[PDB]
Structures are given as structure tokens and as C-alpha cells.
């Protein structure tokens, strides 16, 4: 009745097998009950006192774990490194030969037997490269309908009907570059398109990496971090599912490879990324999306057509876009003043729409009550730049938050559960009482661009 266990090594044409047991390799014969053809390398085999294989089960689930270094060209062996940097050339079991194993993978091995059984997932490597689930939708973004259409055309359509593209032999876009004034909603568009692609498939994966997080004190770490990020992206996309990689605040890292900063390591970081996008090895289902409020500071090598070929310019919202944003951030469920509710006879939607219209009319006006800045150009002409030329979406959010805070103060002072239009009207002028980083030093680059649009160089900036 008692029976031992052993590790199968290989099969022979003589209907004989090799079994590792008790630290020794032996030549055995399979029992007539079992079929020698069904045997697989590394499979546990049940032995007996007569040293005959009678049954083969699954693979061993316990033992040491080693880091994979390389796969030998023969395709049946792998070089791995032990815990104490001891290097072993171990056999690969049948399950090892998802995606093919890469260097750095952890394998369950037993040194005495010398076989690699199972690839053991590691939580640390998964945590190193974050993959969150975006929740922002196209509804949350207003006033950028044409930009949403463009990003749908450059991302959604190639994967909706990719068979049509293959029939037309069209290559799906490989890079999208969002640029514009700060606070205009660069990250929201990327999050929305990622969420839409995630819902569209019926599976995708999204990688978000920030700018400063790719900076290290030593030399040679940012490049290997980028290499690991792109290796993860390739691993995820090898199954055929599209993968989106988003670089946030590309202005800070990998600037112009020329003069740029007088003391920076940038000259050795941008080419690596270039080699990760265009090179002898070409990624297949990876889309790189970059967002930077300073498009002129980005490396022209990155901006070359073929890498980040799609270029979208976000612009500051106008009056209609401001109304759209206010409608997005003001819902029917929001409490309103009882007087307005009585005036609208319970038509809450009409009340909030009218309040939004009044607010956006107040914000966009040439009256000297909404003066923001005084600009003197090279010709010497003084022009009053009002809020109309600096109505960013984040500014609208701050206005709404301040108005809601004023409403909280009013309801805690009086007790009536409502929101007054005068609250938002006062918040409009109280928004610029505190700095919103819109004003800057003598000659900012944004104001230089605005002057280039105007045609006369801006020389004097005065707070009003």
C-alpha cells in the first residue's frame, strides 16, 4: 500500500522514463495501466517498492523561489539566480513552455531536482506600475466637443473597426499630444478616453505615470524605470488588447535635448524614450499620450511625425463653454433659495439654468468691475485684460466651491436651506481677491505667446 513520489525528467523511445527520487536519478518503466505518451516533463510520478511508475499527478507547489535571468537558446533550459546570488541552469517544465517568461520573473524550483515548475506572481512588481480604473466620463467634460471628437477619431475608431483598417492597410495612431493653457482640462480628457475604451471593450489596461516620479538621485535609474514601464506595457498588450500609457507633465522631464537647462541630465533620458517608441523593436498595441502646457519646451525629436503625431490644442473656454462647465458642476439636486423656487414655481431645472446664464453673463463683460490685468505692449498701448481671457475650468470649479462655502455660511447664519444667485455673483469677484497663479513675473512665456498672437511684444504687466 505505501507509495513514494518522484520528479519526472524525460521520456525515452524504449517506453522508459527518468525519475528523480531520494536525491538520485533512476531509470524506471511505466506501469501498463498508465500511458507513457501522456507524461510531461517535471510532472510528479507515484512510485512503489518495485520502482515502477503507477500514477502521475500534478506539479509540486512548494519549494524555493528564484529570479529568472535568461532563457537558453535550446528552449528547454533557463538560467536563474538563487537567493544568495547562486546561479543555476535549471530545466523548464511543460507549463512554462500567458506570455513567454521574461527576465525578472520568479520561478518555483527545487535545486536538488533542478526543475522550474510554476511562475509565481509577485505583488511588488504589480504595485510598482500602477493601473487604476478611471471613472471620469465624457459627460463630465464640457465645452470641448470637437477635441473629444478628435480624440475619439484618433483612439476609439482604430479599435472599433480594426478589420476595416487592415483592409485599408492603415496604421493606428501611436501618439497623442494634448497642449494648451494650464487648467483647461488636459488630464480629464485622457481619463475620459481611458474609461471609454475600458467600457467599450466587451479588458484593457491603463498606465498613468507622473513627471517628477521618474527622477532619481543616481544615474541610470530613470532609464531603467522607463524600460520597465514599456516592458510592462508590451506584456499587457501582447494579448492583443490595446494599452494606453499616459505621461503627465512632460514639461518637467525630457525637455529639449539641446541647451535647455544649463545643468540637467535630460540629454540621457529623452533618447531612451525615443528608442522605446521608434526603434528596431516596434510596439504594436501601445498608445502614448502626453500632456504639457508648454509645447515649445518638449523635445522636437519626440514631436517628430510618427511619434506623438496626433496633436490637439486645448484652448481657454469661451462663454458657451463656461455655461457648459457650470451646467456640469451645477445639478438639479443642488439646493436653491426658496424665493427662486417660488419664482420658478418649482421648475428647478429652469431656475438653475437661469442662474447659470446670469453667472456666465456676469463673468463675461467689458465693464470695469471685472478688471484683471493691465498689459502694455511694445507699441505702448495699454489694454485691460479682463477675466474673459483667463476663464479656466479649474477657476470655474474654485468659483463654484467658494459660492457653496458662502451658501453654507448663509444657511448656518440664517437657517433657510437654499442657495442664492448673489452668492455666486459675489464669488465671481471674490475669486480674484486671492491669487489663482494667473499673474506672473515681468515677461512670462504664456504672455509672450499671447503677444505673438497680438503682434506686439508684451513689456509691462500691472495688477489691477
Amino acid at each position: 500500500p505505501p507509495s513514494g513520489y518522484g520528479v519526472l525528467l524525460a521520456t525515452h523511445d524504449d517506453d522508459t522514463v527518468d525519475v528523480f527520487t531520494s536525491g538520485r536519478k533512476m531509470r524506471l518503466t511505466c506501469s501498463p495501466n498508465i500511458d507513457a505518451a501522456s507524461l510531461k516533463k517535471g510532472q510528479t510520478v507515484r512510485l512503489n517498492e518495485a520502482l515502477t511508475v503507477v500514477e502521475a499527478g500534478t506539479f509540486e507547489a512548494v519549494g524555493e523561489i528564484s529570479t529568472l535571468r535568461e532563457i537558453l537558446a535550446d528552449g528547454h533550459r533557463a538560467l536563474v539566480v538563487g537567493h544568495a546570488d547562486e546561479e543555476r541552469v535549471v530545466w523548464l517544465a511543460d507549463p512554462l513552455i500567458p506570455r513567454k517568461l521574461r527576465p525578472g520573473d520568479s520561478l518555483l524550483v527545487d535545486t536538488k531536482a533542478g526543475y522550474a515548475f510554476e511562475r509565481i506572481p509577485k505583488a511588488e512588481v504589480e504595485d510598482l506600475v500602477l493601473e487604476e480604473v478611471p471613472d471620469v466620463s465624457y459627460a463630465d467634460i464640457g465645452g470641448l466637443s470637437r477635441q473629444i471628437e478628435q480624440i475619439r477619431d484618433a483612439v476609439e475608431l482604430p479599435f472599433l473597426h480594426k478589420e476595416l483598417y487592415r483592409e485599408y492597410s492603415l496604421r493606428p495612431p501611436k501618439g497623442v499630444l494634448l497642449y494648451g493653457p494650464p487648467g483647461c482640462g488636459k488630464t480629464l480628457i485622457a481619463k475620459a478616453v481611458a474609461n471609454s475604451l475600458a467600457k467599450k471593450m466587451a479588458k484593457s489596461y491603463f498606465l498613468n505615470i507622473k513627471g517628477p516620479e521618474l527622477l532619481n538621485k543616481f544615474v541610470g535609474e530613470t532609464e531603467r524605470h522607463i524600460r520597465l514601464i514599456f516592458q510592462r506595457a508590451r506584456e499587457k498588450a501582447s494579448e492583443g488588447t490595446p494599452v494606453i500609457v499616459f505621461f503627465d507633465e512632460m514639461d518637467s522631464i525630457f525637455r529639449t535635448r539641446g541647451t535647455g537647462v544649463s545643468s540637467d541630465v535630460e540629454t540621457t533620458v529623452v533618447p531612451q524614450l525615443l528608442s522605446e517608441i521608434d526603434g528596431v523593436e516596434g510596439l504594436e498595441n501601445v498608445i502614448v499620450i502626453g500632456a504639457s502646457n508648454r509645447e515649445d519646451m518638449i523635445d522636437p525629436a519626440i514631436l517628430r511625425p510618427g511619434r506623438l503625431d496626433v496633436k490637439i490644442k486645448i484652448e481657454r473656454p469661451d462663454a458657451e463653454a463656461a455655461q457648459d462647465i457650470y451646467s456640469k458642476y451645477l445639478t438639479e439636486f443642488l439646493p436653491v433659495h426658496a424665493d427662486d423656487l417660488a419664482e420658478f414655481d418649482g421648475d428647478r431645472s429652469a431656475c438653475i439654468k437661469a442662474m447659470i446664464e446670469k453667472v456666465v453673463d456676469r463673468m463675461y463683460a467689458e465693464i470695469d468691475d471685472n478688471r484683471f490685468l493691465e498689459v502694455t505692449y511694445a507699441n505702448g498701448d495699454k489694454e485691460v485684460m479682463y477675466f474673459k481671457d483667463f476663464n479656466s475650468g479649474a477657476m470655474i470649479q474654485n468659483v463654484v466651491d467658494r459660492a457653496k462655502k458662502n451658501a453654507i455660511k448663509s444657511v448656518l447664519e440664517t437657517g433657510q436651506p437654499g442657495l442664492r444667485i448673489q452668492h455666486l455673483l459675489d464669488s465671481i469677484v471674490d475669486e480674484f481677491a486671492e491669487n489663482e497663479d494667473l499673474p506672473n513675473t515681468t515677461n512670462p512665456d504664456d504672455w509672450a505667446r499671447i503677444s505673438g498672437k497680438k503682434g506686439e511684444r508684451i513689456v509691462y504687466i500691472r495688477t489691477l
Partner: peptide, 17 residues
């Protein structure tokens, strides 16, 4: 504003059989 290169210092370790 400068980069560095690391030199390792091996720690003592010994096992039996």
C-alpha cells in the same frame, strides 16, 4: 545638481551544507 555612482559593501554570510 549632480549624479552619483554606488559602490557596494558585501555583508558577511555563511551556511552549513
Amino acid at each position: 545638481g549632480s549624479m552619483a555612482q554606488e559602490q557596494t559593501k558585501r555583508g558577511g554570510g555563511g551556511g552549513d551544507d
